[PDB]
Amino acid sequence: GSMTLVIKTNEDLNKLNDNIHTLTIGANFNQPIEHIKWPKLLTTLTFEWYFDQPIENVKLPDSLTTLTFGYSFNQPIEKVKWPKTLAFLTFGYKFNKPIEKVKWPDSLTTLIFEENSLFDQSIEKIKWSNSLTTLIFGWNFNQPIENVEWPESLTTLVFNEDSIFNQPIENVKWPKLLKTIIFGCHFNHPIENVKWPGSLTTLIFGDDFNQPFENVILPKSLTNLTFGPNFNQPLNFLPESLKNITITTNYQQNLYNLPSSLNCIKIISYKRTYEHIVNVLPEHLKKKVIKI
Amino acid sequence: GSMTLVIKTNEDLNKLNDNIHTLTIGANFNQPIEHIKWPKLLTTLTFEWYFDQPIENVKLPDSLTTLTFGYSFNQPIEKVKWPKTLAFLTFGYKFNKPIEKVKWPDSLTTLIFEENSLFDQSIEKIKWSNSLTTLIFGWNFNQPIENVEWPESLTTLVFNEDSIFNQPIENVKWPKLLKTIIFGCHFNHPIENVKWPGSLTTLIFGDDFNQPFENVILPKSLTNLTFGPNFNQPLNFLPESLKNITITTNYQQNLYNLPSSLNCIKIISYKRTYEHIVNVLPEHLKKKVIKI
């Protein structure tokens, strides 16, 4: 007897019962759900492309460990009674609604936004789940984080490589267990007055990031450090416990004061810049340049 | 009244008559055509992929202005009686036969080889039609041209950007009205003693081209000059007529001597190399560097 179900038609609603632990909705159209009786032992629920219906007054089974929202979903969620055992939550492309007053279940460990998520709302007043370990943002998120109470359970914080996030972070208070921080394309802010968590092992910067490292100090635990095409600042005071570094061919600074023991140095070959040609040009012709 | 036909089968030959001005031999048709009576006012003829049959003993109508050969066509043509009004001839990929005794009709203006044409035969003894204006070579053509009798009607000479053509050209007799010369990837020979035509407006060089321009004089008619990635020679005596120039980011020379009256200086960015960061790296760490 079957325990998985994909309700494509309106006919398939007669097919759901309490033996269904895996459910999929919204394959072909925005199926309304306000008056559906959910299976008592539902473990996974996936909302497909077309689904967009309010949920603030829908009681999902507390059995639900995994919930995925689809392309079209965009509704307020600050009023929702989340399942008690929800651990994994994924949000779709079109969802952009305030969550600053949401009541997370303390069982949530992973929160992921879609790669190109429209999500751009303030989060400085949020109460994170005490079990949150992984938080992944999308393309369009750009809000300050200097006054966010990160839970001590947080180990991984990731922005999409094409994130437009660019805010000051010098007054951020990181948790003591945060292992991985990954910034995106647009982040370029001073980091001299940042106290990184002593448990930090992986730190990744993006394209636009180019800041000085003369008054910076990194944790003794740092082992993986990557840089972007625009980073052209000297590296003298890197921690001697560093293991892997990554830089680009746009880097034109001396590397005599780098730590030993580095088991990998990755250089990323990028398309070269133009200054070395424009500088050796006649002044009256520098305005006549086309950069391809 | 249909005046257009595509022949795919032996049966379709019965659809031939004198009303057909546009004829196409189907992709799968590979049959002898020595005994075909061709439409009297045939204007355009196209052979598709699989056609490979002798044509020396075929008399195509004199009204045929546009003629095209397909992928598989590879047959001797030096004995062919070409139409009195042929203007546009195209050869396919697999065509590779001598053309030095061809007897072109004086109406031929345009001769094109397919992009990857295997055509590689000497042409120094050829008699060009007095109306040839545009001649385009393919990939594999590499034969001397210094002793070629070019017709004074030739305006455009092009090698494919991937051409393996690499021969001396310092003794070539360029026609007076030649206006566009484009060289391919592999051309790399001195041009110090080349007498460029006084009507030349466009000259393009390819990737491998790296020859000095100290003792070079270009016409006061030249407007467009292009160089490739390997070009790293100083440019101190370009004509004051030049309007557009193209270079790459691999150009490590000063350009203070560029002409005024330039309207556009195109700089193409290429993938940078790694040595400029390795030669400034701690000696004991250079071993473990990984290049991507």
Numbering used by the authors:
A (entry chain EEE), B (entry chain AAA): -1 to 290
Give the original sentences from the paper that presented this experimental model.
The Cafeteria roenbergensis virus (Crov), Dictyostelium, and other species encode a large family of leucine-rich repeat (LRR) proteins with FGxxFN motifs. We now report the first structures, namely those of Crov588 and Crov537.
Crov539 and Crov527 represent the second sub-class of the here analyzed repeat proteins with an LxxLxFGxxFNQPIExVxW/LPxx consensus (supplementary sequence file). We crystallized Crov539 and solved its structure by molecular replacement using a homology model based upon the Crov588 structure. Crov539 has a short and curved core comprising 12 regularly shaped repeats. This core is flanked by a compact 15-residue N-terminal capping module. At the C-terminus, a unique domain swapping arrangement occurs where the last repeat(s) (261–290) of the first molecule extends across and caps another molecule to form a dimer. Dimerization is also evident in gelfiltration experiments. For both the Crov527 and Crov539 repeats, the packing within the hydrophobic core is altered through a substitution of the LP motif for WP at positions 19–20. The restriction between prolines 13 and 20 and the inclusion of a bulky tryptophan residue gives rise to a reversal of the hydrophobic core packing at residues 17 and 18. Unlike Crov588, Crov539 lacks the histidine ladder derived from position 3 of the repeat as this residue is almost exclusively threonine. Residue 5 on the concave surface of the repeat is uncharged and either threonine at the N-terminus of the structure or isoleucine (Ile110, Ile134, Ile156, Ile180, Ile202) towards the C-terminal region, creating a hydrophobic patch at the center of the lower concave surface.
